């Protein structure tokens, strides 16, 4: 995020980091329950990547984080790689996340819910702060 | 480029798809929602993470960080996967697995 600010630690408890086998953060995701993460299809997750829950400072070794194996990647069948449309994947965890103060789920909308233009929302992540 | 160690946040407004098309044209599909163009931008490495809106006291996943400006320009809108268009598939997948 360019021109954002640091979050209060633990205050976005559904936010996960997708890390490759080398430990490199390459995408975010959101817990929707103890067993499932929603992310973008274009992130290209495989069962060799790791879901990391509970992080704030990825430079710290003192946070009680959960490194969760991925059992199966469910890319939305309507995902179109050419247009990047329907850009959603579900990750089924091999073992459940343990929910806590710092690890818990985001709500999902109904298909008919209205989120009007002009509404102020929030986005979070460990993406670049400067290109 | 700068990658942060610490989790970042930003508030930002939802756009209409019609207005978003003024920036991105026919790249904008019904299963996308734009947000930003407001002095902040999602950027590389944010992809897959949440765009949440507070409704009746709870944060609800409205978007998934998807794509946008190749320089993360804060005056152009970011593009997010529109979760309302995708949630029936989420529910079907959870139910079947």
């Amino acid at each position: 995020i360019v021109n954002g600010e640091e979050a209060v630690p633990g205050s976005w408890p559904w936010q996960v980091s997708l890390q490759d086998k080398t430990g490199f953060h390459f995408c975010g995701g959101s817990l929707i329950n103890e067993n499932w993460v929603v992310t973008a299809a274009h992130c290209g997750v495989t069962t060799s990547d790791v879901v990391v829950a509970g992080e704030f400072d990825q430079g710290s070794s003192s946070e009680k984080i959960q490194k969760l194996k991925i059992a199966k990647v469910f890319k939305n069948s309507k995902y179109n790689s050419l247009t990047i449309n329907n850009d959603i994947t579900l990750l089924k965890l091999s073992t459940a996340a343990s929910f806590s103060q710092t690890v818990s789920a985001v709500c999902l909308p109904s298909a008919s819910d209205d989120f009007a233009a002009g509404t102020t929302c929030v986005t979070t992540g460990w993406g670049l702060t400067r290109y | 480029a700068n990658t942060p160690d610490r989790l970042q946040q930003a508030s930002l407004p939802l756009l209409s798809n019609t207005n978003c098309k003024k920036y991105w044209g026919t790249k904008i599909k019904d299963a996308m929602i734009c947000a930003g163009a407001s002095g902040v931008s999602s950027c590389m490495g944010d992809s897959g993470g949440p765009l949440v809106c507070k409704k009746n006291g709870a944060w609800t996943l409205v978007g998934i960080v998807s794509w946008g400006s190749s320089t993360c320009s804060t005056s152009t809108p970011g593009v997010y996967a529109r979760v309302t268009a995708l949630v029936n598939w989420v529910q079907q997948t959870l139910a079947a697995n």
Partner: peptide
């Protein structure tokens, strides 16, 4: 444009 670029994936994010």
């Amino acid at each position: 444009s670029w994936p994010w």
